[PDB]
Amino acid sequence: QERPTFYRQELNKTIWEVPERYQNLSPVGSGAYGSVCAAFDTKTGLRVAVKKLSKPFQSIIHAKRTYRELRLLKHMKHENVIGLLDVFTPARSLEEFNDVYLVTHLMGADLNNIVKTDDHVQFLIYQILRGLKYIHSADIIHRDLKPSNLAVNEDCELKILDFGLTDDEMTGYVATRWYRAPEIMLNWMHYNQTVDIWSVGCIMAELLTGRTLFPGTDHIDQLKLILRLVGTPGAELLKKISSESARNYIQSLTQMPKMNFANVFIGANPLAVDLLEKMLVLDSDKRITAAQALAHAYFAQYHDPDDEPVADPYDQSFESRDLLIDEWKSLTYDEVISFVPPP
Ligand SMILES: Cn1c(=O)c(Oc2ccc(F)cc2F)cc2cnc(NC3CCOCC3)nc21
């Protein structure tokens, strides 16, 4: 990190100050907690996405999430997971440290601007599960997996964005909620990493049919659509719903049996139907895991147990830690300073 020369440019109505190596900066749009620009990295020859974080140390919540995102991106080193090519600040010291810029691969499209074959579905879902196995192996949950954070290149090579990171944007007929596990949508319980597997199920179904699986007009309508497909919960699951209020509402609903998935997904590969049945289980305890799903017959042509790596241990003790703004800021600066680019 032998200090490069920085230059200034106005882009997303703020001034961006970036090393000379990054040229031809052009806005892509909004990212998680900041705006994103496309650029050409003259050092590596890669087309890159550069995210400038907005007000990264404005509050404790902002400072902690800035540290969180940096920690997450620095840890992730997997073909199917967004990772960090570079991180920089124009600041020369902790004292003047105010801005954080994050750099990753520029991707061609997301899964939204791709669909509306079974072999393509196989490859796409395989890579999502491969990436999820890695993320989950580090005790990280995505929590908000959806087509818009699944980015793909021209060769259909896929990377997962925005892992591990309001009510109004969750309201109504919105894609922001359509892929959410019911237990997290309705805050039933302390949830596990198979919330992400529910999301994969929804995504896979949509790739297969060209249609949203559970296009609910609101939380309640969406629950009804879900329960019509998978059945109303039994006593066993009801017990696990620790929210007495949520549990009480569920029991008010007329009981419905699980539907026949072969009659729902007409003409689909029987192995795809089988996998969907194992992913779209209401009881999260009983959902197929990413590692288990990779071994399912549906992915026979792609599955390789020696080419599906797990992550190094990820220390997130910081998550249960209470610190001041300047403390989170200092930790973040340390991580910026210690960054080593990938080979
Ligand atoms: C929307 N978006 C991000 O939010 C994003 O976040 C970052 C994460 C970590 C970093 F170090 C830096 C980041 F910029 C990266 C990103 C890459 N490629 C693309 N391609 C678009 C995908 C949708 O179709 C148009 C091209 N979009 C992206």
Swiss-Prot record:
Inhibition and activation profile: Activated by cell stresses such as DNA damage, heat shock, osmotic shock, anisomycin and sodium arsenite, as well as pro-inflammatory stimuli such as bacterial lipopolysaccharide (LPS) and interleukin-1. Activation occurs through dual phosphorylation of Thr-171 and Tyr-173 by either of two dual specificity kinases, MAP2K3/MKK3 or MAP2K6/MKK6, and potentially also MAP2K4/MKK4, as well as by TAB1-mediated autophosphorylation.
Active site (record annotation): 162 (proton acceptor)
One GO process term, biological-process aspect: cellular response to lipoteichoic acid
Protein name: Mitogen-activated protein kinase 14
Matching Gene3D superfamilies: Phosphorylase Kinase, domain 1, Transferase(Phosphotransferase) domain 1
Cofactors that this protein relies on: Mg(2+)
Stated family: Belongs to the protein kinase superfamily. CMGC Ser/Thr protein kinase family. MAP kinase subfamily.
Family matches, as InterPro entries: Kinase-like_dom_sf, MAP_kinase, MAP_kinase_CS, MAPK14, MAPK_p38-like, Prot_kinase_dom, Protein_kinase_ATP_BS
Top-level EC class as recorded in UniProt: transferase
Keyword Transit peptide: no
Known tissue expression: Brain, heart, placenta, pancreas and skeletal muscle. Expressed to a lesser extent in lung, liver and kidney.
Residue positions where N6-acetyllysine is found in the record: 51, 146
The keyword Transferase appears for this protein: yes
Post-translational changes noted in the entry: Dually phosphorylated on Thr-171 and Tyr-173 by the MAP2Ks MAP2K3/MKK3, MAP2K4/MKK4 and MAP2K6/MKK6 in response to inflammatory citokines, environmental stress or growth factors, which activates the enzyme. Dual phosphorylation can also be mediated by TAB1-mediated autophosphorylation. TCR engagement in T-cells also leads to Tyr-314 phosphorylation by ZAP70. Dephosphorylated and inactivated by DUPS1, DUSP10 and DUSP16. PPM1D also mediates dephosphorylation and inactivation of MAPK14. Acetylated at Lys-51 and Lys-146 by KAT2B and EP300. Acetylation at Lys-51 increases the affinity for ATP and enhances kinase activity. Lys-51 and Lys-146 are deacetylated by HDAC3.
Single Gene Ontology MF annotation: protein serine kinase activity
Catalytic activity: L-seryl-[protein] + ATP = O-phospho-L-seryl-[protein] + ADP + H(+); L-threonyl-[protein] + ATP = O-phospho-L-threonyl-[protein] + ADP + H(+)
Subunit structure, interactors included: Component of a signaling complex containing at least AKAP13, PKN1, MAPK14, ZAK and MAP2K3. Within this complex, AKAP13 interacts directly with PKN1, which in turn recruits MAPK14, MAP2K3 and ZAK. Binds to a kinase interaction motif within the protein tyrosine phosphatase, PTPRR. This interaction retains MAPK14 in the cytoplasm and prevents nuclear accumulation. Interacts with SPAG9 and GADD45A. Interacts with CDC25B, CDC25C, DUSP1, DUSP10, DUSP16, NP60, SUPT20H and TAB1. Interacts with casein kinase II subunits CSNK2A1 and CSNK2B. Interacts with PPM1D.
PROSITE patterns: MAPK, PROTEIN_KINASE_ATP, PROTEIN_KINASE_DOM
Pfam families (UniProt xref): Pkinase (PF00069)
Species for this entry: Homo sapiens (Human)
